[PDB]
Amino acid sequence: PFTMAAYTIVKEEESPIAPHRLFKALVLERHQVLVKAQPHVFKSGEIIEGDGGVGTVTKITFVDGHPLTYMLHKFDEIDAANFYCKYTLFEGDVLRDNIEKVVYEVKLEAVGGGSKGKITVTYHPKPGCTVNEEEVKIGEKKAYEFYKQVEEYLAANPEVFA
Amino acid sequence: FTMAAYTIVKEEESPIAPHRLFKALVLERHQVLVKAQPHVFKSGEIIEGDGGVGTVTKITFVDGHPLTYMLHKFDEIDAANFYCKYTLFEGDVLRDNIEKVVYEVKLEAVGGGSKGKITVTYHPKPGCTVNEEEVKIGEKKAYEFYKQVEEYLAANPEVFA
Amino acid sequence: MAAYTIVKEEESPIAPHRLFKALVLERHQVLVKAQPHVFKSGEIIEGDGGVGTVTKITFVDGHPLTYMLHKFDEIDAANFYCKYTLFEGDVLRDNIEKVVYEVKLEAVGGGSKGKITVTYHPKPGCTVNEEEVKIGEKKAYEFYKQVEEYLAANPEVFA
Amino acid sequence: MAAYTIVKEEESPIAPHRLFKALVLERHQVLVKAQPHVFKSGEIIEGDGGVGTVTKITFVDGHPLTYMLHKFDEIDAANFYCKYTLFEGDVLRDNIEKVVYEVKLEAVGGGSKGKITVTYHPKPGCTVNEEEVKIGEKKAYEFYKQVEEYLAANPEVFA
Amino acid sequence: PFTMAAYTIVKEEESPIAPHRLFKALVLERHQVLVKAQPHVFKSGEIIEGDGGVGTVTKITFVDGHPLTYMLHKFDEIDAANFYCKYTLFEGDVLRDNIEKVVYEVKLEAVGGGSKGKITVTYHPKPGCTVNEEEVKIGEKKAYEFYKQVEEYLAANPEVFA
Amino acid sequence: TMAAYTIVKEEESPIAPHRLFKALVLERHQVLVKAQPHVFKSGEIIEGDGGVGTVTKITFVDGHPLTYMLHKFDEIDAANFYCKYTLFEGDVLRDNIEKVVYEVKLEAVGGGSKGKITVTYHPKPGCTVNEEEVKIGEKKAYEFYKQVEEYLAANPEVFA
Amino acid sequence: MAAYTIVKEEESPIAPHRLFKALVLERHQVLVKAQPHVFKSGEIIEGDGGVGTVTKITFVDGHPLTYMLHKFDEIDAANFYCKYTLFEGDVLRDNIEKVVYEVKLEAVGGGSKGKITVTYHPKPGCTVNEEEVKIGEKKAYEFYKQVEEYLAANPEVFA
Ligand SMILES: O=S(=O)(O)c1cccc2cccc(Nc3ccccc3)c12
Ligand SMILES: O=S(=O)(O)c1cccc2cccc(Nc3ccccc3)c12
Ligand SMILES: O=S(=O)(O)c1cccc2cccc(Nc3ccccc3)c12
Ligand SMILES: O=S(=O)(O)c1cccc2cccc(Nc3ccccc3)c12
Ligand SMILES: O=S(=O)(O)c1cccc2cccc(Nc3ccccc3)c12
Ligand SMILES: O=S(=O)(O)c1cccc2cccc(Nc3ccccc3)c12
Ligand SMILES: O=S(=O)(O)c1cccc2cccc(Nc3ccccc3)c12
Ligand SMILES: O=S(=O)(O)c1cccc2cccc(Nc3ccccc3)c12
Ligand SMILES: O=S(=O)(O)c1cccc2cccc(Nc3ccccc3)c12
Ligand SMILES: O=S(=O)(O)c1cccc2cccc(Nc3ccccc3)c12
Ligand SMILES: O=S(=O)(O)c1cccc2cccc(Nc3ccccc3)c12
Ligand SMILES: O=S(=O)(O)c1cccc2cccc(Nc3ccccc3)c12
Ligand SMILES: O=S(=O)(O)c1cccc2cccc(Nc3ccccc3)c12
Ligand SMILES: O=S(=O)(O)c1cccc2cccc(Nc3ccccc3)c12
Ligand SMILES: O=S(=O)(O)c1cccc2cccc(Nc3ccccc3)c12
Ligand SMILES: O=S(=O)(O)c1cccc2cccc(Nc3ccccc3)c12
Ligand SMILES: O=S(=O)(O)c1cccc2cccc(Nc3ccccc3)c12
Ligand SMILES: O=S(=O)(O)c1cccc2cccc(Nc3ccccc3)c12
Ligand SMILES: O=S(=O)(O)c1cccc2cccc(Nc3ccccc3)c12
Ligand SMILES: O=S(=O)(O)c1cccc2cccc(Nc3ccccc3)c12
Ligand SMILES: O=S(=O)(O)c1cccc2cccc(Nc3ccccc3)c12
Ligand SMILES: O=S(=O)(O)c1cccc2cccc(Nc3ccccc3)c12
Ligand SMILES: O=S(=O)(O)c1cccc2cccc(Nc3ccccc3)c12
Ligand SMILES: O=S(=O)(O)c1cccc2cccc(Nc3ccccc3)c12
Ligand SMILES: O=S(=O)(O)c1cccc2cccc(Nc3ccccc3)c12
Ligand SMILES: O=S(=O)(O)c1cccc2cccc(Nc3ccccc3)c12
Ligand SMILES: O=S(=O)(O)c1cccc2cccc(Nc3ccccc3)c12
Ligand SMILES: O=S(=O)(O)c1cccc2cccc(Nc3ccccc3)c12
Ligand SMILES: O=S(=O)(O)c1cccc2cccc(Nc3ccccc3)c12
Ligand SMILES: O=S(=O)(O)c1cccc2cccc(Nc3ccccc3)c12
């Protein structure tokens, strides 16, 4: 068949945060950060397999009250210096029933005393599924509010990764 | 036909990030030179421009110091992309044989750090020759001062952030 | 807003400079050699094969379709990398504002592999079909097939 | 290391796209059009005609010089911007490694103004014959005035 | 009882010739092309163990009168998809008494109509020997000459190994 | 035409790779001090989290002839127990040495390991490489490895 | 979590070299020779002829099936060992993910022995059929005997 039936989103945003600051906080140490940022949803942040760099995979344990339980992510392609990333989740009740995997691709660029981000995120539908075209704002929505939050903390304390 | 200038093209790496060097070693290079070297630098201030392109700073040296002051104007500033074109265009730092020294700076973010490429051009007055030293001693200073700035910034992460 | 994208993972015996030239750099003039039964003419309207160059491709008189202009956004031929815009043209229906292709081939032994990221965009306050998307793919996929056959049997072409 | 640089401002009655096309884009070719007693051929050997493009300029057999090579670093035929480099040939000799040219034109009336920057890059621990400078400046300024005269007199060319 | 110091040469080069033809010419089907380009020099060249792939042992014949006689090359590693090879010259009179082995690590890239390349050549001495920088420059010039002949021949005939 | 000198070595050990690869690659900068607190004062990563591009700095003891040396992980593949790290800065190079490249490939063998290691000596343009440097360097690196081996054999929890 | 394995010990008076060259290496070419009224062609599309090679098998004008896709996984002609996958064709009949034939011949006297282990894999949600696999062994076994006797007749065949 015309086998190409997948769902991807790409946005760009502007923040007064040196890239290195958002990369560390939203990619390199996201597992650690989501917890400190939304302590009420995340109980633990840790690496299961890896010593940093590519090939390292994350475990994100929710508080024992949250509908969800954990996220599995792994480090695919990392180009440190330019702030480029490809990672994805490959197991955890967070799937919500409409994906085989979720590949997150991000690349940032220094922009004044802040940054520019190009985010490629692909929600992979599965056989006999019609990936929720209404479930789009939501998956995104968790990451944005968490972005807006990491920001403020990062804006408030510049020495944290600068 | 046209008089040749002596050009300095420099490639530099730092652990310090781009908005911070560019802050220190360009716009507030005159102000930071005082904070940076109070045994040589009496005062740094802007005498033309509110801080925008075509701005003219004025740098004066402690009295007993041979040199008196320096004037640089900002040809153009792409602050967004950390580019500046600036020229040293007055003072006895120039002696007689130099008409103007042009500085061209552009940085790039590289991880936690920064890469910086910088040109400097020495325009010799009509007929006179290029004071090779002028450049060497000009190079030594602008840098030695950078190196001082880097240890200070590394040591102080809340400055220019 | 809407973001319904395709993701190709094609691979063929043709060397990548041969396809990068045949399907990216010189597509417009190649579309007429291959399907002289659909296309009358393919040429740049301004530009230097760099970025900001614009091609126009005219369909035969009889054809319901009239024309399309392509504008290169960014290139890097030595790497067989291109992102190109289909902004104006008859074929461009109401629901669609543009379609965007992103090319990056690589060498594989005496041939190549390539991942494509076509991106059919809608016009303010209008929705994107599957049919529409499904046809673009068939057109382009069929074009290459017809071309692969040709670069295969005439190896000097763009070699 | 010590580089010798010539920056200057020039002014022409000739339209800024014609002058650029003639003295940047098609230079390798127009060099041969305006001085057939010096150059026998002018061509591209690497690229389409965009950044990274490499030209070969060959002198007539009887000329002492043999050929020279140039590469484009950046073009932006949109805003008349180019940076190219002379990185091979006997005009370079042993002292000089390469010569980099930055041109930036713009329209003033039916004509133009420009800023050219030539910088002769001497090999490690070598000197640049301040003369090598004065010779380049000359050869080019002459060429530019020849062409300007043809173009003034032949208004349809590159128009 | 320290190891024998082996002499390593690292070269980077370029050809407008495409890398599949150049790998074929200068790696895969070398033993035969040596014979096409310099017949005044080489009599024959063959496969006498292996299927082209890894483990292959090639034997190349000098002309009768040539002061050199024979050489066996063994293919240590072959990844023909990525233009990457590693093979060994171990058997032959070209090997001065003072030389145990010459190992070649080749890796080409694609650049437009042609290629970019990195070649590693290490000459391994025999027990308690001084590699004569003589022989080093010797083969090295030989094989670059060869590089230049072939390149010129290919640029001439675009189908060969196309 | 300007050469470099390379020592190619194949090794065996009763320690398992993953353990060896952590002792003698990643945390080599640290352990060196553990192993030889009389030669080294510290071992630290200036730049990186541990990945391609990561650089480390190792400091010698006050009395020792040397001062420092930093290494660059040009390539890593902890999954395959392969690495490529270069010594590019330090007194240890004299004036003669441009850089030293370390290429390691370890391989599980029963409860043990076999390691394939190359060490390439690249000289400063125009300068030579004197075996003196490369006999003294192989030996140092290897003595260290035998100390480590002992310790980890007698300490099964360490880098388990 | 299912798969139909089948281990058969066989013995023959043909030396293991020829047997390896006739029911493994050149089979596909040999099937048309012995059973021509059943076959058209055996060839390669993307294979060296050694480890990692592929083959394809075409019957005659009407035969139900069309062609068989056999890869090569692990070869060692020296020790007359071979694995060859069968993942495409229409003999898979919607049940067969693949069929993995695994051979290993050894010289005995002037003849040979053989441990043959065919295999039939199931695509998730497919029935691991009973008598179908029974035709597998039948086809092959029967050929072997035709071949076996042929190599007796013409002994110089395949040295
Ligand atoms: O710690 S917290 O103040 O809770 C914290 C709270 C909220 C947002 C944060 C964002 C980035 C880094 C933090 N700290 C951090 C701490 C340890 C390692 C890395 C980052 C943030
Ligand atoms: O987006 S994340 O930034 O990882 C994220 C950030 C912050 C809180 C989150 C809570 C639940 C699920 C996530 N992921 C998720 C993913 C897809 C759909 C719905 C939720 C959360
Ligand atoms: O917020 S989102 O784009 O949704 C976002 C979504 C998912 C992953 C992200 C990773 C880094 C930065 C983001 N945002 C960002 C925003 C402004 C400036 C810089 C980075 C990410
Ligand atoms: O960013 S937040 O408001 O935090 C936010 C939190 C949670 C879900 C969101 C979904 C869409 C847009 C948001 N931002 C937004 C901001 C301003 C106006 C409209 C939407 C969402
Ligand atoms: O202006 S800077 O290089 O910033 C500079 C920075 C710091 C200290 C300096 C001392 C003397 C002269 C300078 N300039 C100079 C310029 C041209 C010729 C000779 C000296 C110094
Ligand atoms: O475009 S092709 O599909 O190969 C093609 C298809 C059909 C007919 C063609 C006739 C001539 C040249 C072609 N190609 C060609 C391409 C580039 C340069 C010169 C000729 C033809
Ligand atoms: O428009 S063209 O007809 O080619 C053209 C014609 C004549 C002179 C030109 C000079 C500069 C750029 C052009 N074009 C261009 C177009 C698009 C992008 C960049 C440059 C010129
Ligand atoms: O393939 S499509 O055009 O999508 C197509 C879609 C639906 C029905 C079609 C019927 C005939 C020919 C087609 N193609 C065609 C294309 C170009 C010229 C002439 C006919 C049809
Ligand atoms: O530009 S291509 O798709 O490559 C293309 C290639 C070959 C033939 C085509 C014929 C008609 C329309 C196209 N574009 C088109 C685009 C979107 C939807 C439907 C048709 C054709
Ligand atoms: O046209 S159809 O067969 O309707 C078609 C149907 C379904 C999927 C297709 C995918 C690609 C190309 C098509 N056409 C095609 C035509 C000729 C050669 C190669 C592909 C597809
Ligand atoms: O795949 S196609 O469907 O023809 C295709 C469809 C749409 C756009 C394409 C652009 C470039 C190359 C293609 N093909 C390609 C084929 C083989 C290798 C590399 C690229 C494109
Ligand atoms: O005169 S040239 O200035 O070289 C010249 C300059 C610029 C553009 C030209 C275009 C056509 C012919 C020329 N010359 C020419 C010369 C001899 C015979 C025919 C044409 C052009
Ligand atoms: O070089 S050429 O010989 O035109 C060439 C010929 C044929 C196919 C090519 C494909 C890509 C790039 C080229 N050149 C190129 C050169 C420099 C920069 C970018 C592309 C190709
Ligand atoms: O090679 S020439 O074409 O003359 C030449 C061409 C252009 C620039 C030159 C600059 C210096 C010396 C040359 N030659 C030279 C020749 C003899 C004696 C001294 C200098 C130059
Ligand atoms: O450039 S030179 O002749 O070498 C030169 C050298 C010294 C002084 C000159 C004064 C005017 C014109 C020149 N040249 C000139 C050359 C060609 C045409 C017209 C004038 C002068
Ligand atoms: O390419 S041009 O300068 O414009 C050039 C233009 C016209 C005629 C020239 C004759 C000789 C050398 C050139 N180049 C040259 C370059 C460097 C030094 C000396 C001469 C000539
Ligand atoms: O002739 S020169 O300036 O020497 C010259 C030297 C080298 C490259 C040039 C390219 C374009 C125009 C020139 N002249 C020019 C003159 C007037 C207006 C704009 C450009 C060039
Ligand atoms: O003993 S030796 O006789 O020199 C000797 C003789 C022959 C082979 C040897 C190999 C390794 C180490 C030795 N000696 C050694 C001595 C002291 C400490 C460490 C190693 C060897
Ligand atoms: O043509 S030859 O004259 O033997 C020849 C001459 C010189 C260099 C050659 C290099 C590679 C292949 C050849 N021949 C070749 C011929 C047919 C197919 C493949 C390679 C070369
Ligand atoms: O290098 S080869 O490419 O095989 C080679 C290629 C072409 C001609 C050769 C002639 C003599 C010796 C070789 N090899 C050789 C090797 C090592 C040391 C000395 C000579 C020749
Ligand atoms: O000529 S050499 O570099 O010596 C060379 C020496 C020995 C083996 C070689 C194998 C392939 C290509 C070469 N050269 C090459 C040159 C430029 C680009 C790609 C490959 C080989
Ligand atoms: O090898 S040759 O075969 O004479 C040769 C042939 C063809 C082109 C050459 C270009 C540059 C240098 C050569 N020789 C060369 C010789 C020694 C050192 C560096 C280059 C070239
Ligand atoms: O530091 S440990 O982590 O145990 C350690 C880890 C790995 C290897 C070690 C080798 C020698 C000594 C250690 N410790 C040691 C401690 C005190 C005095 C002397 C040696 C080693
Ligand atoms: O400390 S050592 O380990 O020997 C040492 C090892 C490796 C490299 C050295 C370089 C310079 C001096 C050292 N010390 C030195 C001591 C005496 C004579 C010569 C050099 C070096
Ligand atoms: O760095 S290591 O080999 O790990 C090393 C480990 C342990 C002790 C060392 C003492 C001196 C020099 C080293 N390096 C060295 C490097 C090159 C030449 C000579 C000595 C030492
Ligand atoms: O020759 S034939 O008589 O066609 C022949 C006919 C019928 C069955 C055969 C079976 C195996 C080999 C043959 N011959 C063969 C000949 C040469 C090479 C390989 C196989 C068979
Ligand atoms: O069998 S024979 O026919 O004599 C025979 C035929 C062909 C080749 C033979 C090779 C070795 C031994 C035989 N004798 C032998 C004896 C007992 C068992 C197996 C082989 C050979
Ligand atoms: O077994 S094969 O050796 O390929 C085979 C060998 C000889 C003749 C065959 C005829 C038909 C089908 C086959 N394969 C087949 C396989 C499984 C089930 C049914 C038929 C034949
Ligand atoms: O068992 S058969 O059914 O012919 C058979 C069926 C399918 C594949 C076979 C592959 C090799 C050898 C066979 N037979 C064989 C027979 C005697 C000795 C050695 C091998 C194969
Ligand atoms: O296909 S059968 O119809 O069964 C068959 C029936 C009668 C005679 C046969 C002779 C050889 C092979 C067969 N194949 C074969 C395969 C396995 C076991 C027994 C025979 C023969």
Numbering used by the authors:
A (entry chain A), E (entry chain h): -2 to 159
B (entry chain i): -1 to 159
C (entry chain B), D (entry chain j), G (entry chain D): 1 to 159
F (entry chain g): 0 to 159
Provide text from the study.
After much debate in the literature about the biological function of these abundant proteins, a consensus seems to be converging on their role in the binding and transport of metabolic mediators such as phytohormones, lipids or flavonoids.
A similar association is observed in the present structure, where dimers are created by antiparallel association of the β1 strands of adjacent protein molecules. The characteristic zigzag pattern of the two columns in the unit cell is the result of the noncrystallographic 21/9 screw-axis operation, which combines an ∼180° rotation with an ∼1/18 translation along the screw axis in the direction. In Hyp-1 this internal cavity is divided into two distinct chambers, 1 and 2, with a separating partition (Arg27) and separate entrances, E1 and E2, respectively. Stabilization of ligand molecules in chamber 1 occurs mainly through hydrogen-bond formation between Arg27 and the sulfonate group of ANS. Site 3 is created by stacking interactions, with the ligand molecule held in place between the jaws (Tyr150 from helix α3 and Lys33 from helix α2) of a molecular vise. Furthermore, other buffer-solution molecules (sulfate, HEPES, citrate and dimethyl sulfoxide) were found in the structure at selected ligand-binding sites that are typically reserved for ANS.
